[PDB]
Amino acid sequence: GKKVLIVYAHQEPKSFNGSLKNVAVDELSRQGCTVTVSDLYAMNLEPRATDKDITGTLSNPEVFNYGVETHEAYKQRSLASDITDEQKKVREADLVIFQFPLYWFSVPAILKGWMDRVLCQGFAFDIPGFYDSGLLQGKLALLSVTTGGTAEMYTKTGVNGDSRYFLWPLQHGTLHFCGFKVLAPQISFAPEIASEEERKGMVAAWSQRLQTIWKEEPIPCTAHWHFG
């Protein structure tokens, strides 16, 4: 009995992203997994890191330090309920899948907000407690990303660089930092440009992958993996 959280960042449910989210729900549900989806746009998730994230009185009201205050709030159990509700879902999940379109070589801001606000000190990492000793150690994470650019554009010799280069802040700087074991990324290249049958192939490939997701070895999340 494995539990999966899908953190989904797309405005349109009929989108290619929406279709990949639905494939994941359908296939993981079919296997018997416990499935939860955080539909960020539908939730209107707050993305901004503010003092509204701590309920009640701050440790230092005169000089606001987001990091210090959220860490203390986590320990005193006074974080905002949107945050705590996402932390419960992550705590319980064996696998967290992130489903998003690539925005500026990164995640859409609503998803960046999830990362900034949910993955607080005391919950996702601590001193000590980062990289392999991160507080979410043992859990799996997978980035399922769609792009505007084609696969041939995302090469070492192409204008955009290797797709692996943009993965570094997400996979290493965020997910590994918090102790996640990172499964290989699912990159669905250029669905808007691809033919209908290429798009169906990409959907079929993700469906197929999901069938054996629990047998996968994670990647070695190193500078060498990302940059060669």
Add this chain to the structure above:
Amino acid sequence: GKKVLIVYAHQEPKSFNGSLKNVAVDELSRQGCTVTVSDLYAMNLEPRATDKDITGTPEVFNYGVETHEAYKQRSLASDITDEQKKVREADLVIFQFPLYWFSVPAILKGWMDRVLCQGFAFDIPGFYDSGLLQGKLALLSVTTGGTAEMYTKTGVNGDSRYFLWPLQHGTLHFCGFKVLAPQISFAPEIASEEERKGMVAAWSQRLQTIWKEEPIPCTAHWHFGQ
């Protein structure tokens, strides 16, 4: 007479980020430059990319498609159109922010997602050196929790150039900006009072001659070469 836009993403004005923002306003103001600051948190800037960003003039909503067409029909939300005006006027755009998860805080990511729309910041074709903001300069002034030693090839975080790539190349260069070398103020929370004043003074001092700098070559070799 040079025009500078500072896009500033910090909650507290007494922070180390607030201090670096203030030093930039003070020094550039002293020089006689025109200075505008977009204080994103104080503005409560909308970060989310939604259909509310198109203000007038379908079945399946594609943010990229609709915002591009909206930009051409002069029908983007006023927060966007106001930021675009500031960018259009600016000779230099300084981004002042603490590093959050090897990137910009979400509020600033929202500024990038929403302000730099197709037709305004780039076209296809019309990116990288053909980007629409060609002739302008951008500079990332970034603070970290991690120490400088941590941000090396043999440190736990890897080379700082590795996190700069999506921002400097993938975003700024893509829109046609020429990128001045980043100002990275490592670990002010950990530094002594003296070391901190040093880092503030180093930014102030660099700004005195910022108009004589040449931008970096925003290439893969620059970011990954060694």
